[PDB]
């Protein structure tokens, strides 16, 4: 279970952090 609740998390975070730098170029086009 456990392992498969932090396979979930990383996918979440990395998800994620796939958003945040998406919207950081987003901004850097604005720039």
């Known amino acids: ?3 498969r609740q932090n396979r979930l ?3 979440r ?3 994620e952090e796939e958003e945040n ?3 950081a ?6 720039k």
């Open 1 to 3: 279970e456990k392992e």
């Open 9 to 11: 998390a990383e996918e």
């Open 13 to 15: 975070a990395r998800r």
């Open 21 to 23: 730098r998406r919207k």
């Open 25 to 30: 170029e987003d901004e850097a086009r604005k």
